[PDB]
Amino acid sequence: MSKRKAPQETLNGGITDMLVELANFEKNVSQAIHKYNAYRKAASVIAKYPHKIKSGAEAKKLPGVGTKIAEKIDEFLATGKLRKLEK
Numbered sequence: 203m204s205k206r207k208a209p210q211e212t213l214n215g216g217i218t219d220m221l222v223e224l225a226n227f228e229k230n231v232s233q234a235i236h237k238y239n240a241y242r243k244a245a246s247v248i249a250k251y252p253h254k255i256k257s258g259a260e261a262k263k264l265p266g267v268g269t270k271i272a273e274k275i276d277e278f279l280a281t282g283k284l285r286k287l288e289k
């Protein structure tokens with residue numbers, strides 16, 4: 203908790219963070235469910251990934267992420283279409 207100085211609104215991706223979080227549920231998600239392992243396998247191909255996408259095409263390329271987990275990958279990456287101040 204509190205290592206040096208984390209951003210206030212995260213950077214952009216945040217894929218392996220919200221994916222590993224669902225597996226860390228330790229309450230609503232048991233420790234051996236099918237949907238439970240859906241975020242663990244997808245989190246292995248996402249966290250290794252650059253874990254930062256503007257759309258949901260990168261998750262489709264990952265064979266691990268796509269079986270009902272790709273929807274969550276867009277939940278965090280859905281508000282990543284903000285403008286960057288033109289001119």
